[model samples]
Target: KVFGRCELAAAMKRHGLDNYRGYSLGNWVCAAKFESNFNTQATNRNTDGSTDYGILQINSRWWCNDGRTPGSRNLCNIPCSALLSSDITASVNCAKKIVSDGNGMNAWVAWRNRCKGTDVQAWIRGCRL
Candidate 1:
């Protein structure tokens, strides 16, 4: 399922990421916008043989176990399929763990090049949250 911008904004806000690790909710919204266009099943294969899964593009190499990535860490302790589900709760939980790993939102390169240093508030301009 592809989420509308405002819809994803509210979801992320409700998941306790509003201001996680000094990064505003808008930052996450913007990252998702670029990372996977807010599509729940989006997946991208990386050159390093790892695949990125779900909306936030959680990687299989270090976060989720895809069984294809040879040395997956499964840091989030979930199958990569969990990140592809329409129910984003699991994905959100993994995302929180990703942020908390001391890298903060820098874990997503999409966020660094796009959302970072930008007026992220514009990403959720029409959202009521």
Candidate 2:
């Protein structure tokens, strides 16, 4: 909440997203912009009863615990609040793992559809990581 998109990009790179699990820096930054607009505390509930968390909008269905979202796999193995921190160490690490096991950033609709074909340099420009 305190950081702009550029600052968020810098922080994400500092968190090791500079080499995150084979995805492009532009894809990652664009996903952040489209997913939650760089808000660390962001969350959204889908109509199917699943809840998404944090900057990447990681879902409870396969990533973290958000009690009452049935069939959740808890792949990240950390509290969903960890995703909502200004320091995104836990979230980025978890997202790296997520990308490792799956097609890069495809779990994120924003990344897959919006950022896949979009040029996202503006989201990452001028940010020193």
Candidate 3:
């Protein structure tokens, strides 16, 4: 529902990315498409009563201080519900940093490898700009 082309473009620009420039948009779209279908309200269950929630699929329990709260003020700080507010750019930026960090994606790939029966790293490498 939040997949408006113009709005998505604006959101990408707000995060210092050009929607039509390179593989950034493609990679983002692919990742989001696979992760949560671009739904900001998506929530996935994890072990230990934790969950991954929101557009970027941030783990609410672990990232948001054990799910006692909702959003985070900044990615540099602890994750909170504020991270899932109307500020879609902030959420996307948070995800971008996580993906580029080489940890989140690796974990995601590992999950995909086991759960979805697909090779995430290969998919990532094949993503065209």
Candidate 4:
């Protein structure tokens, strides 16, 4: 499901991530835009042969299971596919855990490369809250 920007913002807020892991709602929404463009079904293949999953593009090396790799850490303990869905509940929980493990939101490359220090208020501008 590729959510519209405002819908995506509302969903994030409704999921109680307003201040999750000491990060602001803007961080979440901003990172999601750069990572997956609000596409719940998004995925990316890294040059290392690992895959990234869902809105946050979690890496298979440490997070979700990439079926081809039998020993994936799968710290989120969910199938990679679980992250690739319109229902964001699982992805939201997994992301919370990812940030909790001391990486901060910088655990996501999108945050570091793009949304990190920029003003992300535009992400939610006129989104009807």
Candidate 5:
């Protein structure tokens, strides 16, 4: 899948904001690499039947409000697919809104810290978005 750097940058900028204190850009990239290997279309079916979809591995049922039915538009309703879609920024923004309750990047940072190890203080800081 095509990972659009521009779209990713915009999403990172919108989410990172001035609160980019804890998580470095390198940390975010590395965390994403560890999470989904930058595969926006990635999906995983948990043993409990819960499903995580997309790059962030968002739970499809939680976002779509649907059951364990695969191929449902509700589950697949995210804005971007594999990052090539022009709607990647909008999709990520929507996800931030959904997950962070409108806090955007702050929530994303929190999520990253929770999922990945929070020892990003040592990672090299990359170009800011």
Candidate 6:
């Protein structure tokens, strides 16, 4: 499932990701923009052979089991495929775990490089909470 910017923001907010772990709704929205452009089925292969899946680009190496990443920690205890669902429940749930596990949003390189230290509010500027 592909989401427009505001649509994604609304969905994330509804899922209780607004201000989740000190990251505002805009921070999450900006991260999603650079990570997957709100595409549920997005995937990217890393040089280390792990894969990043779904809108937040959760990694297979530690977050989810793809059955392909060697020695995966599977800390999220979910299949990587689950992250690709349009519902976004699994994606957001796992993202919360990723943050709660102490990685925070910095787990996402895209967020660190593009969203952090910037005025992320613009990412959700026209959206209603």
- Residue 128 CA displacement from its true place in model 1, Å: 1.1
Native-vs-model 4 lDDT? 0.86
Estimate the TM-score of every prediction. Answer: 0.97, 0.91, 0.58, 0.93, 0.52, 0.97
What tens digits encode model 5's per-residue C-alpha lDDT throughout 2-120? 34444444455556522344444544544444546666666677666656655555555445433554554453354333322333453454454454544433434434554455664
Instruction: Report the lDDT of model 6 for residue 107.
Output: 86
* Residue range 9-117, candidate 4, lDDT tens digits: 8988898877887777778899998899889989888887789888889889888887866456888998999999899988898998999999798899779989888
Model 6 scores worst on lDDT over the 10 consecutive residues at 98-107
Candidate 5 yields a Cα-based lDDT of 0.48
With a 3 Å backbone cut-off (N, CA, C), the pairs that clash in candidate 3 are 23-129, 70-80, 70-81, 71-80, 71-81, 71-82, 72-80, 72-83
What is the per-residue lDDT of model 2 for residues 1-129, given as tens digits with 9 covering 90 to 100?
Answer: 656877877787778887577666777888888888888899998998988888888888888887878877888898787889888888798888888885777878788888887777767777765
- State model 6's lDDT: 0.92
Residue pairs in steric clash, candidate 2?
none
Model 3: weakest 10-residue lDDT segment is 120-129
TM-score of 1: 0.97
Model 6 CA lDDT for position 95: 92
Query: What C-alpha root-mean-square deviation, in Å, does candidate 3 show against the real structure?
Result: 6.4
Candidate 3's TM-score reads: 0.58
Residue-by-residue lDDT tens digits, candidate 6, 13-96: 999999999999999989999999889999999999999999999999999999999887898899999999999989999999
Q: How do the residues 10-88 of candidate 1 rate in per-residue lDDT, one tens digit apiece?
A: 9999888889877888898999999999999999999999999999999998999999998679999999999999888
